[PDB]
C-alpha cells in the first residue's frame, strides 16, 4: 500500500557552462515586471515580486509533455538554457514563455492559469552543437553554439527564421570563433565580447551580432600593464568581462583583484582596485556609467565611473558569481550567490533586490544540505590561492580530473547527510556549515537561515589566505520530542600554525523558541561535554516520560554517556546523570536507543550492545539471573540500534542486519548487508541511511553505483521497507538517483533527500459587456 | 544583506558562587549609616500607610526617623522608665509604646506633645504593644505578668479581653492576617499559644511547641506563621497545627523576624531574621525558606526591620544592635511662537490610516577595538586591547577574535621592543588565570617565534621573558599539584 | 552558619601542624562543607590555590573514611572536581609553552 513520489523542489540550476562569464542567470522578469520566472532542476518556478510568493509552478515530472525530454536514470546533461518572454511562433500577441533547452527543443508554455496539456514545442535542425544561448532584439533572433588543440571550445552564431513550415526553425550561420576562453553579452543583447587564444597569448574580440555595426579585435597584451608581465599569473589571468550597451567601454576583471575599463575606440585603460581577491562578476548599467562588481568578499560594489566612487552592500551570504542590472530604468539588481562554506556542493542562491533601498526583494533558494563528500563534477570556483574553500588559478583542471578519478576508482563513495524534522510544524532543518536552513517542503521554500556557532561566518567576507579558516561544523542537531528545544553539537576548529592548532573544541548548545517566532534562542551551552577534546558520536532526544520529553542523552567514543535534562528550578539545562567508562580504545561506531517506557537504554557501542537501566544508570541487573543477557557481541561494529517498539529492536552493522526480541530474548531475523554496504559509508552513517516508524515498520536503503559495459558517475537507489520485525518486504522501490537521507515525519510518511536535492516521500449583452469591460479596464 | 554581528564577549564556563539575582538585589542595599544610641535598640517598627518613617525604641525615648533623610524627624522622650515597644497603628495615625512600668502610652504619630491615652496595664513591665492589623480600635499588650490584654482604646479602664494561660514571660504577640479573631502569642517557655477571641480567652485553642524559648512570632500567610527562638526558626501551618520547616543557620539565638510581600524584587516574599551574633539573613519563603543573602554587623543584632511592601521611594533595611547603635542600609531610586511653529513633533499617528515605521533602533556604542576589528585594523585592535582601562574579559575577547578571525602574525608583524612590552606585560598577568592561559600561550609562542632576534638585541624584554618563565614555572607547579589532588581523591571513590 | 568573615580569619592561619590537628579535631560531618568552601574560594581567587590546597589535602587524608562512606562523592563536592579539572586540564599547553 506504499507509494513513492517526488514532491518537493530542488536546486535552481543556472547555466553550468564554462566560458560564459556575466550572464549565467537564466531567470527572467516579466515585461509587466510583476512576476519573476526562474527555472529549477525539477520545474519552472514563477514567483511574484510584489508578494514574494510562488504563484505558479510548471512541474516537469508532472507530465510526459517535457518529462519525456528528461526522466533518465543516467542522462541529465539535457539542460534548460534560455527563457524568452514573447511567443516565437506568432508575433504581436504576451503572457507565456518560450524555453530553449541545451539540445534543441523549443517549448512554448503558458504560465498564466493551468499549463496546456500539449505545448507548442519544436526541435530545431541542429548539428552536434549544444546551444550556448539564444538572443533577441527588435524582431530578429540569433543563436550561439559550442563545439568539439588544448581543450578549448569553439563557438558559432546562427540566425533564426520560422515562418514557412510551422515545425522547423531555419538557421543562417553568421560567423564562427574557433577558440573561446571567456565570453559575455551586453545587457540589450546587441553585442558580445569574448577571448580567443590566438598567437603569443590570448586575444579579445567584440562583435555586434544583430548587425555588422562593429567588430573589433586586439591582443590583450595592449590591455595589460607592463608590471603584470613580471608578476604572478593572477595578474594576467582574467576571470570576468563585460560590455555596455554602446560598445564604447569594456570591463576586464582579473584574478588578481583589479578591474580595468578599456575604452574600445582607442584602447586606453583605467584601473579600479578594490577587490582584494579575484573578481568574479561584472556588469554595467544601461547608460554605462555604473559598474556592478562582485567577488570573494561577499560585498557587491557599484562603481560610480564618473568619480570612481564605490557604494557597497557587504554581507550577502554568498560570493557574487553573477550580478546584473535588470529593469528598464535599472531598478533591480539580480545576483547569484554561491554560498561556499560547504565544499561538497555548489548551492546557489538567486537574489534580486530593488535598487532603491537595496533590500532583497524576492530571494530564491533551494534546500541546502551538506553532503559528506563532493557530488558530481562539482568544482569550487576560481580564486587567487588554492584553499579549502576554493582552488587556485592552476588546479581547476587537475582538481576535476582528480574528482572524477575519485568517483570512479575509490571505495568510500558515501556523501550522506543528516536532516531533521521539527516535530511541531513539520519543516525540515538542513544544518549548513555553522548555520541551519529551516525549510518547509509543502511549498519548498526556505523559512529562514540562522547562524548557530561563533565564527567569522557573517561578519566578514574572507579572502585569499583567510579562506583556509573554517567556521565550526554543526554535526548533530536533534529536537526534543515535543519540538520545544533543539539540541545541537558543533566542532570548533582552531586556526593553523599556532600552539592550539591540534586540539578541537566540542560545544553542545540548547536552543528554544515558542511556536510563533522563526528563530531560536540559546538558553545554555556546554563547552567540552564529556571532557576535553572528546567528541560526541551520537545525541539522542528523550521520550515523553523522563522529564516530560526534556532530556537528551549524549554518547562518547569512549562509550561514556551523559544524560542532560532541563529543570525549571535552576532555570537551565543541566547535567543529571553520568556513566563514564575509562577504556583505552576509541571507536565512533556508537549508537543509542531508548525504551518508550523510559526504563532501559540500549547503548550500541562498537561490537557490543550494552543494556543499561535508567534508575541507577549502570548495566541492567536482576538478582534472580533470569537469563539476564545484557550484552550482544555481534560480528562487526554496530551502527544502528533502532528499536521499533518495546518488544524488539533492529541492529544494523557493517556485515549483517539483525533483529532481537526481548519478550522472547533471542535473535528472530537477520539479513545480509556486506554485498551492498561494504566499506562505502563512514561508520556512523547507517543511522541516517535507515530509519523507522512508531507503528508501521522500518526502512532500509541501499545504493548501487551503476556500471558500463568499471563503475561510473551514475547512481540508482533501492529503498525497501519492512513491517513488524523484518517480516515482509512490502515496499521495494527504485529511485533514479543517489539517495542521501531518509526519515519518518510524525504522521506516517517517510521523506528522503535525493543527491540533487529533490525531497521525495514514501507514503500510504451583459456577459459580453463584462468580458469587454474587464478587457478595456485593465 | 544583513547587519554586522556584534563582537561577542568571551564568557567561560561559570565558576561556583555566582551572583544570584536575590543577592544582587539584596547587595544593592548600601551606604550604611551608624547612629550611636544611648542604649541597646530593642524594637523597631515602620509606618504602614505612607510607609516612609520608622520608629526606633532605644532606652527611655522613641525616635521616628524619616526614610529620605535618615535623620530623626521626631522624638518621644517623656517616658519614666525604659520604653520597650513602639508600633504604629494600621492606619499609621497613632503610635503605641509599652514602657517598663507597665504603662502603655499611645500618642499620635508626628506629634510627640499630645499623649492621647495612657493605659495603665500591669504593674510588671509591658514588653510588647501592637494594635490589631485588621481592627483599628483594639490594642494588644503583653507584659511580664504572663498575661496579654486586648484593650479597646475607647474604654481604656478595664481590658476588654484578658488572654492568660502562659507559664513564663510572654514577649511576643501576632495577629493572623485574614481571620481577625485569632491572636498568636509567644512566651519564654516555648509554646506558642493562640487564642480565639470570641471564646473565653483564658485557654488557647491549641499550642505550638517550639522547644526553645521563643523570641518572636510573625505571621506570613493567613495560614502559616514563623516563630523564632533559640538558634533556629520554625514555620507552622495553622490550619493543620503542624510544623513544616525549620532553619537553624545561626550560631546564637534568633532575636527577631519580619516579612515582606509583593515589593519590587526578584524575591516575591522575604523573611529576614536577626540573631544576636552579628548576622541578619534573608530567607525566601517560596523555595523552602532557603537563605539568599546576609549582612554581618559590628555586634549582636537585637532587632531588625525593612521598608514595608508599598514603599514607593527610598527603601530601607534597618538593624538595631545590642551594642547601642543603629545601622541603616538603603537602596535608592522655548517660546510659544516657536512651539506653534514646531507644533506637530509629538503626534505618533493616532487618527491616521497607515502608520509606517522604519526608524532603526540605535544599538550600543562600539568600543574602539570592535570598530578597529570592523575596519580591519588588526594591529590597532591589539593596541586598543592593551590600554590600561580595559576589562580583562575585553582584552581576552579581542585576543580571541584576532586569533579565530585572522592572524596573530598580522596583528604582531610591525612591532619592535617598545610596542611588544604591552602584550608581554599583560601576558604576565593573564598567564595566572585559567580562562586566558591558552590564548596567552599561543600569543607568547607566536611572538617568540617571529621576534627571536629582538630577544638578542633588546635586554629589556629578555627580563620580561625571564619573568614570564618563572610565571609559567609557578603555574606548571600549580597545574601539576592540581592533578595530584585529582588523583588523591580519585583514590577515594 | 555561612560566615565568610571569620572563615577568612580561621583560614588565614597557615602553620602546617595547626592546620593538621585542626582538621583532625574537626567533626567529620562538616569536612565536606569546609572542602566546599575551600573549593569555591580557590575557584574564584586563583592565588589562594597555593595556600588553601594545603587545607584540602589534609581534609582528605584525615577524613578518609567519612567521604569514602558518603554515597555521592563527586555530586557532593562537584566544585572541587570542576576546579581541579580546569586547573590541570591545560597542563600540556603550558608544558609546550615553557618548552
Amino acid at each position: 500500500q506504499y507509494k513513492l513520489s517526488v514532491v518537493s523542489g530542488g536546486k535552481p540550476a543556472l547555466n553550468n557552462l564554462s566560458s560564459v562569464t556575466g550572464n549565467k542567470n537564466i531567470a527572467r522578469l516579466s515585461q509587466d515586471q510583476r512576476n519573476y520566472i526562474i527555472p529549477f532542476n525539477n520545474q519552472i518556478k514563477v514567483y511574484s515580486v510584489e508578494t514574494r510568493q510562488c504563484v505558479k509552478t510548471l512541474k516537469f515530472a508532472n507530465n510526459s509533455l517535457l518529462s519525456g525530454i528528461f526522466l533518465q536514470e543516467e542522462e541529465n546533461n539535457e539542460s534548460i538554457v534560455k527563457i524568452l518572454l514573447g511567443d516565437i511562433t506568432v508575433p504581436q500577441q504576451a503572457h507565456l514563455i518560450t524555453v530553449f533547452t541545451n539540445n534543441g527543443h523549443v517549448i512554448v508554455l503558458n504560465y498564466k492559469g493551468k499549463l496546456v496539456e500539449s505545448p507548442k514545442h519544436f526541435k530545431i535542425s541542429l548539428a552536434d552543437e549544444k546551444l550556448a544561448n539564444v538572443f533577441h532584439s527588435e524582431g530578429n533572433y540569433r543563436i550561439l553554439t559550442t563545439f568539439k588543440h588544448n581543450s578549448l571550445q569553439s563557438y558559432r552564431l546562427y540566425a533564426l527564421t520560422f515562418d514557412d513550415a510551422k515545425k522547423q526553425f531555419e538557421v543562417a550561420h553568421q560567423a564562427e570563433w574557433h577558440n573561446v576562453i571567456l565570453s559575455n553579452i551586453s545587457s540589450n543583447g546587441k553585442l558580445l565580447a569574448h577571448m580567443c587564444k590566438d598567437v603569443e597569448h590570448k586575444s579579445i574580440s567584440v562583435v555586434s551580432l544583430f548587425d555588422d555595426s562593429v567588430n573589433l579585435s586586439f591582443p590583450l597584451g595592449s590591455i595589460l600593464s607592463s608590471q603584470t608581465q613580471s608578476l604572478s599569473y593572477n595578474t594576467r589571468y582574467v576571470s570576468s568581462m563585460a560590455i555596455d550597451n554602446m560598445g564604447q567601454q569594456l570591463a576586464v576583471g582579473f584574478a588578481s583583484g583589479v578591474i580595468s575599463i578599456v575604452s574600445l575606440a582607442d584602447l586606453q585603460i583605467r584601473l579600479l582596485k578594490w577587490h582584494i581577491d579575484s573578481v568574479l562578476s561584472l556588469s554595467f548599467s544601461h547608460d554605462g556609467s555604473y559598474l556592478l562588481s562582485g567577488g570573494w568578499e561577499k560585498v557587491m560594489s557599484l562603481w560610480q565611473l564618473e568619480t570612481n566612487s564605490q557604494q557597497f552592500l557587504p554581507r550577502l551570504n554568498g560570493i557574487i558569481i553573477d550580478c546584473q542590472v535588470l529593469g528598464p530604468q535599472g531598478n533591480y539588481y539580480s545576483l547569484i550567490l554561491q554560498m561556499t562554506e560547504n565544499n561538497s556542493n555548489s548551492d546557489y542562491q538567486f537574489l534580486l533586490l530593488n535598487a532603491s533601498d537595496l533590500t532583497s526583494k524576492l530571494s530564491i533558494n533551494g534546500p541546502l544540505p551538506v553532503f559528506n563528500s563532493t557530488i558530481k563534477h562539482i568544482q569550487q570556483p576560481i580564486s587567487a590561492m588554492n584553499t579549502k574553500n576554493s582552488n587556485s588559478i592552476t588546479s581547476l583542471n587537475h582538481s576535476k580530473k582528480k574528482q572524477s578519478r575519485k568517483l570512479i576508482k575509490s571505495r568510500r563513495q558515501d556523501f550522506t547527510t543528516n536532516v531533521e524534522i521539527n516535530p511541531i510544524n513539520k519543516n525540515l532543518y538542513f544544518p549548513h556549515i555553522s548555520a541551519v536552513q529551516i525549510f518547509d517542503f509543502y511549498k519548498n521554500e526556505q523559512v529562514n537561515y540562522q547562524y548557530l556557532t561563533s565564527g567569522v561566518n557573517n561578519s566578514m567576507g574572507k579572502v585569499r589566505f583567510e579562506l583556509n579558516l573554517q567556521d565550526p561544523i554543526i554535526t548533530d542537531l536533534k529536537f526534543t520530542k515535543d519540538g520545544q528545544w533543539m539540541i545541537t553539537y558543533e566542532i570548533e576548529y582552531p586556526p593553523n600554525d599556532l600552539l592550539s592548532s591540534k586540539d578541537l573544541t566540542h560545544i553542545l548548545k540548547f536552543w528554544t523558541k515558542n511556536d510563533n517566532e522563526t528563530n531560536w534562542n540559546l538558553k545554555t551551552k556546554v563547552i567540552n561535554p564529556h571532557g576535553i577534546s572528546v567528541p560526541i558520536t551520537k545525541i539522542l532526544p528523550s521520550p515523553r516520560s523522563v522529564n516530560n520529553s526534556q532530556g537528551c542523552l549524549t554518547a562518547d567514543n569512549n562509550g561514556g554517556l551523559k544524560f542532560w535534562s532541563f529543570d525549571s528550578h535552576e532555570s537551565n539545562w543541566c547535567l543529571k546523570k553520568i556513566s563514564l567508562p575509562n577504556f583505552n580504545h576509541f571507536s565512533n561506531s556508537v549508537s543509542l536507543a531508548w525504551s518508550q517506557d523510559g526504563s532501559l537504554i540500549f547503548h550500541g557501542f562498537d561490537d557490543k550492545l550494552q543494556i543499561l537501566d535508567f534508575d541507577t544508570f549502570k548495566k541492567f541487573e536482576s538478582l534472580e539471573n533470569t537469563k539476564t543477557v545484557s550484552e550482544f557481541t555481534l560480528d562487526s561494529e554496530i551502527q544502528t540500534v533502532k528499536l521499533i517498539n518495546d518488544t524488539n529492536l533492529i541492529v544494523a552493522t557493517r556485515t549483517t542486519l539483525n533483529a532481537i526480541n526481548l519478550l522472547r530474548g533471542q535473535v528472530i531475523n537477520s539479513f545480509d548487508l556486506y554485498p551492498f554496504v561494504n566499506g562505502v559509508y563512514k561508520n556512523g552513517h547507517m543511522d541516517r541511511l535507515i530509519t523507522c516508524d512508531e507503528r508501521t515498520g522500518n526502512i532500509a536503503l541501499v545504493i548501487n553505483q551503476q556500471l558500463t559495459d568499471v563503475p561510473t558517475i551514475n547512481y540508482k537507489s533501492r529503498i525497501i521497507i519492512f513491517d513488524s520485525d523484518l517480516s515482509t518486504k512490502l515496499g521495494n522501490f527504485t529511485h533514479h538517483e543517489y539517495i542521501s537521507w531518509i526519515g519518518w515525519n510524525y504522521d506516517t510518511d517517510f521523506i528522503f533527500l535525493d543527491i540533487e536535492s529533490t525531497l521525495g516521500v514514501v507514503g500510504t449583452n451583459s456577459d459580453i459587456f463584462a468580458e469587454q469591460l474587464h478587457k478595456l479596464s485593465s | 544583506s544583513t547587519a554586522r554581528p556584534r563582537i561577542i564577549t568571551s564568557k567561560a564556563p561559570l565558576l561556583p558562587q555566582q551572583t544570584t539575582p536575590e543577592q544582587r538585589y539584596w547587595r544593592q542595599y548600601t551606604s550604611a549609616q551608624l547612629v550611636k544610641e544611648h542604649n541597646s535598640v530593642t524594637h523597631i517598627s515602620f509606618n504602614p500607610q505612607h510607609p516612609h518613617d520608622f520608629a526606633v525604641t532605644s532606652s527611655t525615648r522613641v525616635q521616628i526617623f524619616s526614610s529620605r533623610t535618615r535623620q530623626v524627624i521626631k522624638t518621644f522622650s517623656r517616658f519614666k522608665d525604659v520604653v520597650y515597644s513602639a508600633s504604629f497603628r494600621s492606619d499609621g495615625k497613632l503610635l503605641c509604646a509599652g514602657d517598663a512600668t507597665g504603662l502603655v502610652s499611645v500618642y499620635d504619630s508626628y506629634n510627640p506633645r499630645t499623649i492621647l491615652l495612657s493605659i495603665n496595664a500591669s504593674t510588671h513591665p509591658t514588653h510588647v504593644t501592637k494594635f490589631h492589623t485588621q481592627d483599628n480600635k483594639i490594642l494588644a499588650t503583653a507584659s511580664d505578668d504572663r498575661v496579654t490584654r486586648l484593650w479597646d482604646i475607647s474604654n481604656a479602664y478595664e481590658p476588654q479581653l484578658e488572654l492568660t494561660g502562659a507559664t513564663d514571660y510572654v514577649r511576643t504577640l501576632s495577629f493572623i492576617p485574614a481571620a481577625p479573631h485569632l491572636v498568636a502569642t509567644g512566651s519564654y517557655d516555648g509554646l506558642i499559644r493562640l487564642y480565639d477571641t470570641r471564646s473565653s480567652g483564658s485557654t488557647p485553642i491549641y499550642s505550638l511547641n517550639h522547644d526553645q524559648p521563643v523570641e518572636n512570632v510573625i505571621a506570613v500567610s493567613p495560614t502559616q506563621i514563623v516563630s523564632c527562638g533559640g538558634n533556629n526558626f520554625k514555620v507552622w501551618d495553622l490550619t493543620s497545627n503542624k510544623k513544616l520547616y525549620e532553619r537553624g543557620n545561626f550560631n546564637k539565638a534568633v532575636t527577631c523576624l519580619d516579612y515582606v510581600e509583593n515589593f519590587d524584587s526578584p524575591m516575591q516574599s522575604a523573611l529576614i531574621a536577626s540573631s544576636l551574633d552579628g548576622h541578619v539573613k534573608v530567607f525566601d519563603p517560596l523555595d523552602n525558606f532557603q537563605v539568599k543573602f546576609g549582612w554581618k554587623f559590628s555586634g549582636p543584632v537585637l532587632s531588625c526591620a525593612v521598608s514595608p511592601s508599598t514603599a514607593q521611594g527610598n527603601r530601607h533595611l534597618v538593624a538595631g544592635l545590642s551594642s547601642g547603635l543603629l545601622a541603616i542600609r538603603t537602596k535608592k531610586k522655548k517660546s510659544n511662537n516657536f512651539q506653534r511653529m514646531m507644533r506637530g513633533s509629538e503626534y505618533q499617528g493616532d487618527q491616521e490610516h497607515i502608520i509606517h515605521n522604519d526608524k532603526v533602533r540605535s544599538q550600543r556604542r562600539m568600543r574602539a577595538f570592535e570598530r578597529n576589528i570592523n575596519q580591519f585594523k588588526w594591529s590597532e585592535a591589539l593596541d586598543n586591547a592593551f590600554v590600561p582601562g580595559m576589562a580583562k574579559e575585553l582584552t581576552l575577547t579581542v585576543l580571541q577574535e584576532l586569533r579565530k578571525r585572522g592572524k596573530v602574525r598580522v596583528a604582531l608583524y610591525g612591532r619592535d621592543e617598545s610596542t611588544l612590552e604591552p602584550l608581554l606585560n599583560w601576558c604576565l598577568k593573564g598567564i595566572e588565570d585559567v580562562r586566558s592561559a591558552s590564548i596567552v600561550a599561543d600569543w607568547v609562542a607566536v611572538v617568540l617565534e617571529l621576534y627571536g632576534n629582538t630577544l638578542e638585541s633588546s635586554p629589556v624584554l629578555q627580563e620580561l621573558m625571564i619573568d614570564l618563565k618563572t610565571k609559567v614555572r609557578h603555574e606548571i607547579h600549580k597545574s601539576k599539584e592540581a592533578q595530584r589532588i585529582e588523583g588523591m581523591l580519585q583514590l577515594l571513590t | 552558619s555561612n560566615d565568610h568573615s571569620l572563615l577568612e580569619t580561621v583560614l588565614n592561619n597557615r602553620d602546617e601542624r595547626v592546620i593538621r590537628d585542626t582538621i583532625f579535631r574537626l567533626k567529620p560531618a562538616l569536612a565536606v562543607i569546609l572542602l566546599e568552601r575551600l573549593a569555591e574560594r580557590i575557584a574564584r581567587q586563583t592565588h589562594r590555590q597555593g595556600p588553601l590546597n594545603v587545607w584540602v589535602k589534609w581534609c582528605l587524608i584525615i577524613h578518609g573514611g567519612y567521604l569514602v562512606s558518603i554515597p555521592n562523592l563527586m555530586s557532593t563536592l562537584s566544585s572541587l572536581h570542576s576546579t581541579l579539572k580546569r586547573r590541570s586540564d591545560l597542563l600540556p599547553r603550558l608544558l609546550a609553552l615553557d618548552a
Binding site: 540559546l522 556546554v526 567540552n528 543529571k576 | 564568557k11 564556563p13 | 555521592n72 555530586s75 562537584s78 570542576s82
Partner: peptide, 25 residues
C-alpha cells in the same frame, strides 16, 4: 530587517557551563 538577511549569532544571557560540574546526581 530584510527577509534574506540571516540571523546573526548572539549568546545573550545563556549560561555557559563546562562538562565537569557534577552538581546533580
Amino acid at each position: 530587517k530584510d527577509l534574506a538577511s540571516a540571523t546573526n549569532y548572539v549568546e545573550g544571557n545563556a549560561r555557559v557551563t563546562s562538562g565537569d560540574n557534577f552538581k546533580h546526581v
